[PDB]
Amino acid sequence: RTLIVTTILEEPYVMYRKSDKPLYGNDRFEGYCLDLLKELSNILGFLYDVKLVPDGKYGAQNDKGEWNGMVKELIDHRADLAVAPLTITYVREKVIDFSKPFMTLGISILYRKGTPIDSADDLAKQTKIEYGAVRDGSTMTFFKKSKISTYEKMWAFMSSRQQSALVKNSDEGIQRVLTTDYALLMESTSIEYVTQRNCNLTQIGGLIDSKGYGVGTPIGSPYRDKITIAILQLQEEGKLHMMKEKWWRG
Amino acid sequence: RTLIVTTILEEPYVMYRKSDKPLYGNDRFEGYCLDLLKELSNILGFLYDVKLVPDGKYGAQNDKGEWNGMVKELIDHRADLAVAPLTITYVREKVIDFSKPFMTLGISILYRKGTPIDSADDLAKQTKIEYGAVRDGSTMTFFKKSKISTYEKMWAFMSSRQQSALVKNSDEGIQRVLTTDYALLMESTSIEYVTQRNCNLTQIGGLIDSKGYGVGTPIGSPYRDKITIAILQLQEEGKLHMMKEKWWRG
Ligand SMILES: O=C(Nn1c(=O)c(=O)[nH]c2cc(C(F)(F)F)c(F)cc21)c1ccccc1O
Ligand SMILES: O=C(Nn1c(=O)c(=O)[nH]c2cc(C(F)(F)F)c(F)cc21)c1ccccc1O
Ligand SMILES: [Cl-]
Ligand SMILES: [Cl-]
């Protein structure tokens, strides 16, 4: 009767709740995706048990085509839903079902206020102002694998000089923006999170690519269509926006 | 054997092709959605006949709950697909099936370069700089129906003084931006189209809300899942981006 929900630790979607006593159930966790799950459970009417994906991965294939991560938990029917910031992608959609996205995002520009810089093309066109992304992440990988001429050119500049314009992780990139003349190309959701906490920083321009986070279900799940309708209901009602404000607020 | 595809005239998605001789079939039409349809037909393997929605409407309900538009063509099985900039919405998803979105968009800010204005909250906070939207459109309707405090406040200012800050249509709003000190809140897709043709105009900040355009199918259609996978394939391949560049280029 109780649905098993696979998720992953990722701020502010899923986090351990602060407490002294050790905790044991769903009370261990908080965040946007926990609130989303609660709202879904009260629209569709279900009990759930949250279980962190044991390998801590979203889901990718190895050289043999074997899956890992939350995707593999779904494939193997060890979870009924994946409620997490799980990106809807071609290779994943072939092996699991996704709801329509509860959040849409893309790459944007994190910079400083008070500049004539107001576009990504306003960077590919010049060299005075430098730019990078987090090493080995989704954004860097976008630029590295791109065949769009303008982003290839931007990858060429980011990876030049021993890739010095890249950074180890998001926390490191934020500090490099805070302490140096540096712009972090990164997901709009993270930029929004950061600007809420740093008033001289802002997002520049719109989204460079587009993607969505959806709820994953095993193929054939009866919950996929139900959850899509529920997400759309929550969106129409403004509740997705309220939840995002609660967890991104600064 | 031939699929009937309902669509709607909407620049640059679906337009009549320039010619002197009268035309008669799919050759009558061009645009982003015609290119999308061609690509879909070559992935999934189908013949199609394009037919403009006779009432020229996307699809809404009247007081009795009766549908019109492309949505009604699908409900009544007078079309097999709707390939058009058809917004995925709660009320529509209950009566037709949608693919995952081939385009995601939202409301943003169309302004001028060279200002410290870099956010929507950078407007709700002040009064010197004014702002509006197209009368009776999706963007104005967002603000009018919103219960988000900041957008309610923004609706209060837009509709003040006999609603003078609103405009009749997008073409009129563009000219009012070109000839006056005026910012048009409008869909990011239209802003992108306009900025490609006006170099002193730019998008300010990111997206205020989020929505997607999807391919509509009658409920139960076998094509829904096929088309979602196909769109994701095209996106992964960069072809959706190439098509958007072709039709938005300036
Ligand atoms: O995309 C990549 N990782 N990744 C997913 O795969 C997913 O499903 N959700 C994700 C959510 C987040 C969040 F922003 F929420 F923190 C994130 F940072 C990464 C995610 C990825 C990673 C390495 C190289 C290429 C990639 O593309
Ligand atoms: O949303 C409204 N109209 N509308 C749809 O309903 C849809 O499905 N697609 C649409 C695509 C476009 C495009 F930008 F492509 F031109 C558009 F301008 C409008 C669209 C709408 C209209 C009046 C009042 C409230 C509304 O919400
Ligand atoms: Cl769906
Ligand atoms: Cl789908």
From Swiss-Prot, chains A, B:
Residues 116-250 are extracellular. The modification Phosphoserine is found at residue 159. Glycans are attached at residue 200. The modification Phosphothreonine is found at residue 195. It is found in: Cell membrane; Postsynaptic cell membrane. Expressed in the olfactory bulb (at protein level). Expressed in subsets of neurons throughout the developing and adult central and peripheral nervous systems. In the CNS principally in the medial amygdaloid nuclei, medial habenulae, pyriform and cingulate cortices, and Purkinje cell layer. Also highly expressed in embryonic and adult dorsal root ganglia. Expressed at high levels in the trigeminal ganglion neurons. L-glutamate binds at residues 85, 87, 92, 138-139, 187. Belongs to the glutamate-gated ion channel (TC 1.A.10.1) family. GRIK1 subfamily. Ionotropic glutamate receptor that functions as a cation-permeable ligand-gated ion channel, gated by L-glutamate and the glutamatergic agonist kainic acid. L-glutamate acts as an excitatory neurotransmitter at many synapses in the central nervous system. Binding of the excitatory neurotransmitter L-glutamate induces a conformation change, leading to the opening of the cation channel, and thereby converts the chemical signal to an electrical impulse. The receptor then desensitizes rapidly and enters a transient inactive state, characterized by the presence of bound agonist. The postsynaptic actions of Glu are mediated by a variety of receptors that are named according to their selective agonists. This receptor binds domoate > kainate > L-glutamate = quisqualate > CNQX = DNQX > AMPA > dihydrokainate > NMDA. Homotetramer or heterotetramer of pore-forming glutamate receptor subunits. Tetramers may be formed by the dimerization of dimers. Can form functional heteromeric receptors with GRIK4 and GRIK5. Interacts with KLHL17. This is Glutamate receptor ionotropic, kainate 1. It comes from Rattus norvegicus (Rat). The chain holds residues 447 to 816 of 949 of the full protein.
